[PDB]
Amino acid sequence: GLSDGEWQQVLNVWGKVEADIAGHGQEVLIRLFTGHPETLEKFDKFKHLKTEAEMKASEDLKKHGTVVLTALGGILKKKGHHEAELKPLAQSHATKHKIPIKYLEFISDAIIHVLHSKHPGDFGADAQGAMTKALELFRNDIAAKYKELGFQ
Numbered sequence: 001g002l003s004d005g006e007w008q009q010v011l012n013v014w015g016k017v018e019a020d021i022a023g024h025g026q027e028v029l030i031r032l033f034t035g036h037p038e039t040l041e042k043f044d045k046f047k048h049l050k051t052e053a054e055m056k057a058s059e060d061l062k063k064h065g066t067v068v069l070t071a072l073g074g075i076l077k078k079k080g081h082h083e084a085e086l087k088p089l090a091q092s093h094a095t096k097h098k099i100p101i102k103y104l105e106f107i108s109d110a111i112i113h114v115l116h117s118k119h120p121g122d123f124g125a126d127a128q129g130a131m132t133k134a135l136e137l138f139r140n141d142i143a144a145k146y147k148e149l150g151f152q
């Protein structure tokens with residue numbers, strides 16, 4: 001798990017996201033979709049986005065980014081005591097959306113990249129370490145539920 005000092009860094013970094021949740025969310029999803037086009041195919045409602053310009057112009061993509069980052073923020077503020085929050089997300093993403101755990105790795109990496117891109121020089125080495133550990137814990141607990149369901 002994370003130390004209290006590490007959790008404090010996670011939630012300090014998260015204050016940057018909360019100042020512009022929609023912009024961070026849109027950029028996270030765009031980074032995921034352009035870097036890994038197969039992920040776009042999992043969204044019926046985003047398959048029509050042929051270009052990054054269409055993605056950036058999509059108000060509904062920005063809306064979903066707010067949904068995604070609001071959910072992640074709620075989980076992070078539990079500092080690892082997130083079973084109730086995480087279990088339904090793991091179950092919807094395995095059983096309904098059919099999201100391989102690899103794609104959650106992709107989006108975790110996308111979050112780290114967006115943080116550096118929007119806050120260059122202001123996302124320190126300790127902050128990246130702590131946020132990475134928090135995202136790894138999130139992914140690992142999802143993975144446990146994936147394994148329970150036998151989902152690949």
Ligand code: HEM
Nearest residue numbers: 039042043044045067068071072089092097099103104107
């Ligand atoms: C930080 C990681 C993620 C979080 C917090 C997150 C959160 C959410 C939430 C809260 C919803 C709506 C409620 C639900 O269906 O459970 C949702 C829907 C969805 N998620 Fe995720 N998600 C994440 C990653 C991903 C990834 C990586 C993919 C695919 C590559 C994905 C695919 C989908 C799809 C297809 C839907 C339904 C979209 C629709 O409404 O048409 N999710 N997600």
